[PDB]
């Protein structure tokens, strides 16, 4: 018998319309339940009172065939290898014991056969029996988002080395290891219970404004709501494959309660509010939308153009007026996006975001970009699964802390390239890339942990830079990369570039590709007239690219230690002309 919690210290929930389905799209009124894991939670001093918490599951393309296209969409390997991503959310206010049970019939011999990533979370684990581990999750006001990895679920992705770039395969023989991870992943989002002033800010009441409460089922009428707040109670809601909510000017807040599951997407078309909010510990899933679902094409797949950068369905979209505005984006899990997760158009300097306890899961397709934080924004305590640029660092005065990342195949983790940019004062701390499948045999411009990709208009051109733009004063401190990866950093500088600091980029291992495919780059591009951008002087001015405590396999890479070059452990193949614009040293 399912028993959920709803007390002051613990909140869990269920979906009575849950279904097991590993093969195809669920019904409009159904929620996909994990076939592979069951989870229960108890307050640590009440270990006998364990409550069920639902475990959701996303599968590549929702198991759909490609409708309206045959080209690659980026979900080929994940679909063919049978990858899935399960996740369970709950609210807690006090240390808990979480029981995680594997449903497959596979067994484990010890709690050591269940690994937690981030590995820095040295949670106490106890083996209850041969399919169940108990994990002690301490309370933090940030909560914890982490992966639970049963050894029998691990597989290794290999690059078959075919053609120019290779292709991923689960076949080992004669191929190159790329990364080892659970085939059926299991994320736990242990989120802080909201009280006091935080609850008042993040959970609407009837005192917050007029509220529209959608009924469970089809929700295709949201464009004409007249209330200020749309509040989704626990339950399941469906926008369909051919509609997303384009919200009227009165709506300032969308709230997804814990236990709400909304299939759909939201666009705040109007720019008239001083404060926008999208909050709550519910789920917003794009599972019903086709890859590159184009609003110019009746929501069918993109037809008759090069891109749909501004017309394909986004999970969340806002408009920024010249006036100063704020958005609180909190709590929600964005699942199975058909395109980019998040965008703001308008005045990109006057839309200040406060993002926290936000998650993106099931990012199987290419172009499932993570978040772009606009000028003067902060983000903390998040989880991103993405199959494109994960952290789009395109704006000044941006601060990020405590990001757990499950990277897929395509794009880098951190991106600041693609166009010349003017950026100052960026700080990104405590990033853990727990997995990645970055695999390319050829030396691509848009990959590695950190990246300034070449220009989107022509990635092979070296004349697309602008020396009259400057990217400067960006600090990345603590980037923990677990398992194998492909490369550390590739900067194709499209702007003058100054005082970039990467501290404690710690990589467990390189993958099985040739070392030439693992190279890190630092190159100065020109404008069409031939004027080169400049990289600041690092030796001795400290105004170039600083790699402080960059390590591989625990060994710090040092310019003075003979372990830095392209054929050495550090894999650094920076242009010789830029020698005095970088340093690698041990503190």
CA trace torsion 348, 408, 568, 454 (10° rounding): -40
| DSSP letter assigned to residue 315 | S
Q: How far apart are CA 522 and CA 402, in angstroms?
A: 27
Q: What is the CATH number of domain 1-203?
A: 2.60.350.10
| Cβ neighbour number for residue 170 with a 10 Å cutoff | 15
Q: Is 385 helix (H, G, I), strand (E, B) or coil?
A: strand
Task: Name the DSSP letter for residue 6.
Answer: B
Question: 525: part of which helix (H) or strand (E)?
Answer: none
Residue 585 CA to its chain's centroid (Å): 30
Bridge partners, residue 345, by sequence = 319
**Domains of the chain: which residue ranges?**
1-203, 204-587
- Per the CB < 8 A criterion, the answer to whether 251 and 275 are in contact is no
- CA separation for the pair 295, 305 (Å, rounded): 13
DSSP secondary structure letters along 196-220: HHHHHHHS--TTSS-EE-PPSEE--
* Cα(376)–Cα(395) distance, integer angstroms: 8
Q: What is the CA radius of gyration of the chain?
A: 23
DSSP per position, 453-506: ---TT-TT-S---EEEEEEEEEEEEEEEEEEEES-SEEEEESEEEEEEEEEEEE
Instruction: Classify residue 451 as exposed, middle or buried by CB count within 10 Å of its CB (0-12, 13-18, 19+).
Output: buried
- How many angstroms separate the first and last alpha carbons of the chain? 56
What DSSP character marks residue 80? Answer: H
Closest CA to 434 of 120, 189, 118: 118
Q: Is the Cβ–Cβ distance between 460 and 454 less than 8 Å?
A: yes
Cα distances (Å, whole numbers) of residue 221 to 120, 165, 218: 46, 46, 9
Residue 528: partners with Cβ closer than 8 Å, 6 or more residues away: 463
Evaluated on CA atoms 381, 385, 390, 395, the torsion sign reads negative
Beta bridge partners, 555, equal: 552
Q: What φ, ψ does residue 33 adopt, rounded to 5°?
A: -95, 145
Half-sphere exposure at residue 176, Cβ-oriented, CA atoms within 13 angstroms:
24
d(CA 582, CA 587): 15
Q: Under DSSP, is residue 559 helix (H, G, I), strand (E, B) or coil?
A: coil
CA torsion, ordered 403, 409, 414, 416, to nearest 10 deg: -150
Quickly count helices (H) and strands (E) in the chain.
2, 47
CA dist list (Å): 243 to 266, 285, 297, 314, 491: 10, 13, 12, 12, 40
Residue 180 pairs in a beta bridge with 156
Residues 378 and 402: beta-carbon distance below 8 Å: no
Contact 457, 525 (CB under 8 A): no
**Cis peptide bond N-terminal to 243, omega within 30:** no
Cross-strand bridge partners of residue 110: none
DSSP assignment letter at 298: T
Contact in structure between 449 and 428 (CB atoms under 8 Å):
no
CA angle 86, 292, 179 (to 5 degrees): 45
Of 368, 487, 476, 385, the C-alpha closest to 433 is 385
- Determine the Cα–Cα distance for residues 90 and 314; give it in Å rounded to an integer: 26
* Contact (Cβ atoms closer than 8 angstroms) between residue 24 and residue 64: yes
- 471/234 Cα distance (integer angstroms): 45
Residue among 399, 345, 396 at smallest CA distance from 375: 396
List 101's β-bridge partners, or say none: 38, 132
Nearest one of 440, 387, 445, 393 to 414, comparing CA atoms? 393
**Is residue 262 within 8 Å of residue 256, measured between CB atoms?**
yes
**Residues 6 or more apart in contact with residue 410 via CB below 8 angstroms:** 74, 366, 387, 388
- At residue 157, φ and ψ (nearest 5 deg) are -85, 135
Secondary structure of residue 169 in the 3-state scheme: strand
d(Cα 381, Cα 118) in Å, to the nearest integer?
13
Q: What is the DSSP string of 16-49?
A: TTEEE-SSSPPPTT-EEEPSSEEEEEEETT-TT-
Q: Going along 108-252, which residue ranges are E strands?
A: 114-117, 125-129, 132-137, 144-150, 154-159, 168-169, 176-182, 184-192, 211-212, 217-218, 229-232, 235-238, 245-247
What is the side-by-side order of every strand in the sheet holding 125-129? 51-53, 37-43, 96-102, 132-137, 125-129
Q: Which positions ≥6 away from 207 have C-beta within 8 Å?
A: none
Do 265 and 245 touch, CB atoms closer than 8 A? yes
CB atoms within 10 A of CB 573: 21
CA–CA separation, 516 and 161 (whole Å): 14
Give the whole-angstrom CA distance, residue 87 versus residue 33: 9
Q: How far apart are CA 235 and CA 88, in angstroms?
A: 16
């Amino acid at each position: 018998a399912i028993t959920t919690a709803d007390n002051g210290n613990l909140h869990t929930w269920w979906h009575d319309n849950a279904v097991f389905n590993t093969t195809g799209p669920t019904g409009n009124d159904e929620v996909r339940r994990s076939s592979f894991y069951d989870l229960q939670v108890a307050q640590e001093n009440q270990p006998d009172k364990a409550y069920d918490a639902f475990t959701y599951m996303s599968i590549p393309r929702s198991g759909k065939d490609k409708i309206g296209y045959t080209k690659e969409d980026g979900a080929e390997f994940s679909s063919q290898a049978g990858l899935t991503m399960s996740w369970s959310s709950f609210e807690y206010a006090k240390d808990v014991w979480v029981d995680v049970s594997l449903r497959t019939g596979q067994t484990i011999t010890s709690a050591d056969q269940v690994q937690i990533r981030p590995s820095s979370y040295n949670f106490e684990k106890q083996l209850v029996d041969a399919d169940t581990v108990k994990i002690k999750v301490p309370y933090s006001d940030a909560g914890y988002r982490f992966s639970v990895e049963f050894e029998p679920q691990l597989y290794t992705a290999y690059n078959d080395m075919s053609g120019d770039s290779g292709k991923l395969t689960t076949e080992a023989e004669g191929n190159r290891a790329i990364h080892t991870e659970p085939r059926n992943s299991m994320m736990i989002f242990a989120e802080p219970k909201l009280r006091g002033e935080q609850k008042e800010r993040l959970v609407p009441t009837e005192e917050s404004g007029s509220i529209h409460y959608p009924a469970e089922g089809e929700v295709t009428n949201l464009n004409a709501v007249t209330e200020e707040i749309i509040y989704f109670k626990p339950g399941t809601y469906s926008m369909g494959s051919d509609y997303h909510a384009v919200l009227p000017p009165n709506v300032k807040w969308v709230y997804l309660a814990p236990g709400a599951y909304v299939k759909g997407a939201f666009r705040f078309l109007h720019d008239n509010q001083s404060q926008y909010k999208v909050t709550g510990y519910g789920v917003l899933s794009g599972e019903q939308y086709v890859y590159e679902a184009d609003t110019n094409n009746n929501y069918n797949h993109l037809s008759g153009a090069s891109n749909c950068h501004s017309s394909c369905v986004k999970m969340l979209q806002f408009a920024s007026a010249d006036a100063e505005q704020k958005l609180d984006l909190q709590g929600v899990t964005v699942a199975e996006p058909p395109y980019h997760s998040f965008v703001v158009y308008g005045n990109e300097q006057t839309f200040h975001m406060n993002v926290e306890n936000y998650k993106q899961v099931g990012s199987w397709y290419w172009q499932t970009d993570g978040i772009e934080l606009y000028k003067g924004s902060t983000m903390k305590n998040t989880f991103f699964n993405a199959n494109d640029d994960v952290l789009k660092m395109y704006h000044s005065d941006v601060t990020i802390d405590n990001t757990v990342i499950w990277k897929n195949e395509n794009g880098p983790v951190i991106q600041w390239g693609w166009t010349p940019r003017n950026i100052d004062n960026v700080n990104v701390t405590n990033t853990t890339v727990i997995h990645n499948r970055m695999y390319w045999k050829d030396v691509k411009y848009n990959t590695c942990i950190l990246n300034s990709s070449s220009h989107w208009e022509d990635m092979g051109s070296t004349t697309k830079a602008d020396p009259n733009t400057t990217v400067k004063n960006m600090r990345f401190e603590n980037i923990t990369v677990e398992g194998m990866t492909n490369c550390a950093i590739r900067v194709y500088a499209l702007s003058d570039t100054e005082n970039i600091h990467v501290k404690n980029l710690n990589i467990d291992a390189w993958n099985g590709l040739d070392w030439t495919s693992q190279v890190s780059h630092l190159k100065r591009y020109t404008n069409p007239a031939g004027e080169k951008v400049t990289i600041g002087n690092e030796i001795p001015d400290g105004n170039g690219l600083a790699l402080e405590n960059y390590s591989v396999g625990g060994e710090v890479i040092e310019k003075t230690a003979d372990n830095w070059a392209d054929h050495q452990l550090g894999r650094i193949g920076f242009d010789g002309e830029n020698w005095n614009s970088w340093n690698a040293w041990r503190t």
